[PDB]
């Protein structure tokens, strides 16, 4: 067998340790980004919703990198923490050196460059955490970026990771909307997919986290929705669902 070290090449040319890190994201949480013009969002899930969990951060799965960048996380907690620390440090280094915000891709390229280095040098376990990126820049505007524990990344319009990733991406493709992807429709689609990809039904507001990024007067306000607006969003989805039963 050829998965003893992350630098061992299998006879078929497959990095077994890397793919072991890749498939381990199935144990990570569900975070998805829906198609949206003039905006973009991530929809995370809180597995640990135990009542004895006091809530202090409200963004345990949502992290802000730059003034115009936000990222989710799906992987080992410690790896996600160190990766987001390096993310913020690299973004601020770029801001200091160029006096200009990082243009989305070059930050994701920076993380993927750091991440792949763990998959090449021995003695370091590959970073077993994949993370979405949202952001805006003067080059391509709103973008959605998919990190992958192999250091491979990719532009995306609608994708998800974590538990039930395949079901989430298939459902996002079922109603995949190009162009006509207003922020309200994006939020509705995010709630609609989260209703099914999450095993627990009724989509309790406290167990669902949405973070949105919008361009308002050239400020790029990054928003995390409080309990009230998430409650009214799931209420809207519930009222919409009631109409769908008129077929019978």
């Amino acid at each position: 067998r050829y998965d003893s070290r992350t630098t061992i090449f299998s006879p078929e040319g497959r990095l077994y340790q890397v793919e072991y890190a890749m498939e381990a994201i199935g144990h990570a949480g569900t975070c998805l980004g829906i198609l949206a013009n003039d905006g973009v969002l991530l929809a995370a899930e809180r597995r640990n919703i135990h009542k004895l969990l006091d809530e202090v951060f409200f963004s345990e799965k949502i992290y802000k990198l730059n003034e115009d960048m936000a990222c989710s996380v799906a992987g080992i907690t410690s790896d996600a923490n160190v990766l987001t620390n390096e993310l913020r440090l690299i973004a601020q280094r770029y801001l200091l050196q160029y006096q200009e915000p990082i243009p989305c891709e070059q930050l994701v390229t920076a993380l993927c460059d750091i991440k792949q280095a763990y998959t090449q040098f021995g003695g370091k376990r590959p970073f077993g955490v994949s993370l979405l990126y949202i952001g805006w820049d003067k080059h391509y505007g709103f973008q959605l970026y998919q990190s992958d524990p192999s250091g491979n990344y990719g532009g995306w319009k609608a994708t998800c990771i974590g538990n039930n990733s395949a079901a989430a991406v298939s459902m996002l493709k079922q109603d995949y909307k190009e162009g006509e992807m207003t922020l309200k429709s994006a939020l509705a689609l995010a709630i609609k997919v989260l209703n099914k990809t999450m095993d627990v039904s009724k989509l309790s507001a406290e167990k669902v986290e949405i973070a949105t990024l919008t361009r308002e007067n050239g400020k790029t306000v990054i928003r995390v929705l409080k309990q009230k607006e998430v409650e009214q969003l799931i209420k809207k989805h519930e009222e919409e669902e009631a109409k769908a039963e008129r077929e019978k």
Binding site: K61, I76, A80
Partner: protein, 253 residues
């Protein structure tokens, strides 16, 4: 399992009862079926249902019955099993728990199965080998399908590989209605609601829920079961074991 019964009758009953359809169509008769799925779904209940209405010699080879201490004995028993099935043709062999004998071929050596491997290879040749077999069909049922080798699961031996997924709501309601037909249900017991309280209940767990609902009346010396007798019985049968450790549970964000 209405689809599964109809799919399994296209191999067990149709090729035997009316072989003229297959000869006229110009296709070979399907031979083997593999009923795989989570435990408690009906993969062995379907075998009993098939044996109840089959009008063919139904041989049952369940578990490690072909694994003998003496070498070359399990292969001999498989040979005579297929000999007895041929003189009594048409015949149907049902091999429950095929993982016992049909697991993936391990590398020969100190640590590795080699005799159960040998009876497995004899069976492999018996299903599809030099001597073509006539009117012999096998319905071996398993739980793990990925542990079986490529040779035992290759077509020509297993034409249909029928899956037994956990029943849905409209199916669990059906299971609740066939295992409670003899039960003295009261008025106002919505069997669909109890089915709605069992997401992914295997199928044997529905029967367990019915049995425990009856048990909750046995300890009270009654004959009728109420809605609360079922709802308090669902939580008993459909019990879950949590991680019981947030430190391990927060290993992954």
């Amino acid at each position: 399992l209405d689809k599964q019964i109809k799919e399994i009758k296209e191999v067990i009953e149709l090729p035997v009862k009316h072989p003229e359809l297959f000869e006229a169509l110009g296709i070979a008769q399907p031979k083997g079926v593999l009923l795989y799925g989570p435990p408690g779904t009906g993969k062995t209940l379907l075998a009993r249902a098939v044996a109840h209405h089959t009008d063919c010699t139904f041989i049952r080879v369940s578990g490690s019955e072909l694994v003998q201490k003496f070498i070359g004995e399990g292969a001999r028993m498989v040979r005579e099993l297929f000999v007895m099935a041929r003189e009594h043709a048409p015949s149907i062999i049902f091999m429950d728990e095929i993982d016992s004998i049909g697991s993936s071929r391990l590398e020969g050596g100190s640590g590795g199965d080699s005799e159960v491997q040998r009876t497995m290879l004899e069976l492999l040749n018996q299903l599809d080998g030099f001597e073509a077999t006539k009117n012999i069909k096998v319905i071996m049922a398993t739980n793990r399908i990925d542990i079986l080798d490529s040779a035992l699961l290759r077509p020509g031996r297993i034409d249909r590989k029928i899956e037994f997924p956990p029943p849905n709501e409209e199916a669990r309601l059906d299971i609740l209605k066939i295992h409670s037909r003899k039960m003295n249900l009261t008025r106002g017991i919505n069997l669909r609601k109890i089915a709605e309280l069992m997401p992914g209940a295997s199928g044997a767990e529905v029967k367990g829920v019915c049995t425990e609902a009856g048990m909750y009346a046995l300890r009270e010396r009654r004959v009728h079961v109420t809605q609360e007798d079922f709802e308090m019985a669902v939580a008993k049968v459909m019990q879950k074991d949590s991680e019981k450790n947030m430190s391990i549970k927060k290993l992954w964000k």
